[PDB]
Amino acid sequence: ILGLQLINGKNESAHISDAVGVVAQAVHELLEKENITDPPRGCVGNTNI
Amino acid sequence: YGLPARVRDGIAIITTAASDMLSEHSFIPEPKSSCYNTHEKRIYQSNMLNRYLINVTFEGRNLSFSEDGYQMHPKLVIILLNKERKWERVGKWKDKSL
Amino acid sequence: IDLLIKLARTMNFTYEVHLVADGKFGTQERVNNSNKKEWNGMMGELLSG
Amino acid sequence: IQMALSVCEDLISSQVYAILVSHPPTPNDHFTPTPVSYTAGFYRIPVLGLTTRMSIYSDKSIHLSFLRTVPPYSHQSSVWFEMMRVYSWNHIILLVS
Amino acid sequence: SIGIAVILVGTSDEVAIKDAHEKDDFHHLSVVPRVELVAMNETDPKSIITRICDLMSDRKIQGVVFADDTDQEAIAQILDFISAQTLTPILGIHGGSSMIMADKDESSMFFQFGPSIEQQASVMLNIMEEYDWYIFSIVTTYFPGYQDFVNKIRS
Ligand SMILES: *[C@@H]1O[C@H](CO)[C@@H](O)[C@H](O)[C@H]1NC(C)=O
């Protein structure tokens, strides 16, 4: 039975480093932008986006 | 098709399904009346009830339901925008007739 | 059925004949649901194996 | 069922901008991000995936903002194409469920 | 006896709607629908999640009919989620409860009161026939259901 496998595909902790690495420069590019809004206030306070 | 008629017809859809199942199956399931215990009470499945709930009738009508969740013979109207931004009745759909 | 035998003796392959199921030749027709097009008759049995 | 209770009353009230998908103890399970994504996707909140092998979330109709770093099971065909080509194989019998 | 719970959001008269609730001469079959009039501004999912479990815990109900008067484009999707996780059927009647969505889960016993995506394509062309509008062009964007709309046109 011939098959294939992926490297570091089950170790969740390893990919957490890459999860925060990509967002490092993504936030900075968005940080230097105008009309910055805020997330909704609670589940019942806000129903808009 | 007014809202009070929608509720009155909507209620009749549910009543004609579960109550009629008592005529033949004669066993009303009693699910766990709680926010939990959904997985352990899976023995009382609703597949038998789901078998004949699409075919409903209220004092005589054809309200069969599609598996995708749409009515087979709905009632539709056509509207047209006018000068003063008011949609007006134009046509009417009645069982494949215009 | 005489032409078929000539090919059998030249390319040494063995055959067996069987008449068409319905009796037509074959065109493209639309089934009741969607716009799926499938052939019929003698033309449509070659593609079906 | 209790996941929906905690997502709304405890997460979005803390100004959350990105959420990382957890991992089920058993790989056969599927509804690990199902309750979170619906609530998170209600307010157009982007979500990043870490353990997501299901291609259901990538249809672009449902779970529009469901991002992930791990390819699902549906991308294995992109290597089957080349492997049979370099192995000089052209006729393939395809069996699927 | 099986209770029935109905929830509506918007502006209306509560007593007038419930007045005709107890008017069904159902002597043919003892349905006994225990209709409960529940009304609150439950557009947010926070009010829905707590209330839906409270209804069944308080009163054993095996049928729910939902109506609404909101234009929310995602209320049906989250509403189907409750029906997906539960075996109690629920139906959308008015408002955002009956907006068009593509697919349903196998465990989702949810239904809507609205035109079918396929039917509208066939109805719309049925009007073009009556006025001899034999030439047309199609422009569409990305949406859960645009592909199926085109498939009926070419057929
Ligand atoms: C056809 O096949 C036969 C045996 O099946 C063999 O002698 C040869 O491959 C062919 N015969 C010819 C060319 O006469």
User: What chains are in contact with E, requiring at least 3 Cβ pairs below 8 Å?
Assistant: A, B, C, D
CA distance E2 to B30: 10
Q: What stretch of H or E contains B19?
A: helix B3-24
Q: Which residues of A touch D18 (CB under 8 A)?
A: 23
Terminal-to-terminal C-alpha distance of chain C:
21
- Dist. CA E138–CA E125, nearest whole Å: 12
Cα atoms in the Cβ-side hemisphere of radius 13 Å centred on B65: 22
Alpha-carbon gap, residue E51 to D58, rounded angstroms:
32
Residue D85 CA, chain-centre distance (Å), reads 30
Question: Are the C-beta atoms of B7 and E37 separated by less than 8 Å?
Answer: no
CA dist E58 and E3 (Å) reads 10
A18/D18 touch (CB, cutoff 8 Å), yes or no: no
Please enumerate, by residue number, every residue of E annotated as part of a binding site for Zn(2+). 94
Nearest by Cα to E13 from E3, E5, E21, E4: E21
Judge: C34–E155 Cβ closer than 8 Å, yes or no. Answer: yes
Residues of B in Cβ contact (< 8 Å) with D1: 35-36, 38
**Neighbors of chain D by Cβ distance (3+ pairs < 8 Å):** A, B, E
Q: Which of residues 90-149 of E touch B (CB under 8 A)?
A: 91, 93-94, 103-104, 109-116, 119, 123, 126-127, 130
Give CA separation, A38 vs A17, A33, A48, D80, in Å: 26, 14, 11, 46
Q: Which residue among A4, A19, A39 sits closest to D69, beta carbon to beta carbon?
A: A19
Q: Pairing relation of β-strands D47-49 and D66-68? A: parallel
Query: Touching check for E12 and chain C: CB below 8 Å?
Result: no
**Residue A23 forms contact with D (CB below 8 Å):** yes
The number of C-alpha atoms within 13 Å of B36 and in the hemisphere containing its C-beta is 3
Nearest C-alpha neighbor of E101 from the set E85, E81, E87, E86: E81
Best mutation target, A11, A43, A48, to test chain D (most D CBs within 10 A): A43
Q: Could you tell me which residues come within 8 angstroms of residue B33 by beta carbon, excluding any fewer than 6 positions away?
A: E56, E57, E60
- Structural biology method used: cryo-EM
User: Do E44 and E37 form a contact (C-beta atoms < 8 A)?
Assistant: no
Q: Residue E71 is encoded by which pair of tokens? A: 């234009």
CA-based nearest residue in chain B for residue E103:
B68
Rounded Cα distance, B14 and E31, in Å: 9
Q: Is-contact E45 D39, C-beta < 8 A?
A: yes
E33:B93 CB<8 A: no
